[PDB]
Design a protein around this ligand. Sequence first.
Ligand code: BEF
Ligand code: BEF
Ligand code: BEF
Ligand code: BEF
Ligand SMILES: [Mg+2]
Length: 128
Amino acid sequence: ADKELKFLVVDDFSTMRRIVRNLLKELGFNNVEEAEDGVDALNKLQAGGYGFVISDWNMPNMDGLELLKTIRADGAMSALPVLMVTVEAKKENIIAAAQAGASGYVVKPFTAATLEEKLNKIFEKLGM
Ligand code: BEF
Ligand code: BEF
Ligand code: BEF
Ligand code: BEF
Ligand SMILES: [Mg+2]
């Protein structure tokens, strides 16, 4: 995929945002911005130009599921890829996220190999 693709990494733990940013850097993606919850993410998305969102689930103010539903419902960004990356591992969470339009799902903790794979699967599926 295009190495200039612009990512938004959303997670309320700065520890986790840094981890994702660094793995993406390792894979060749340097165009990365950050948000600390769903409200903040929606503010940043309106700056335009974003091509991919990686989102946590548990966050204050607006959680990852609500963020996902908001993205899918808005004509400006309804086809934006959204990869969930979260501690929530239960079947019910995986099902709810998929039903709400998630592009993929990763359970923390995860390796760079898992991320590259999860990312690639989405790139192929969407023709990116
Ligand atoms: F995660 Be933020 F920096 F509070
Ligand atoms: F990165 Be966030 F905006 F604190
Ligand atoms: F807080 Be996240 F859902 F891992
Ligand atoms: F459960 Be399906 F999406 F109607
Ligand atoms: Mg969290």
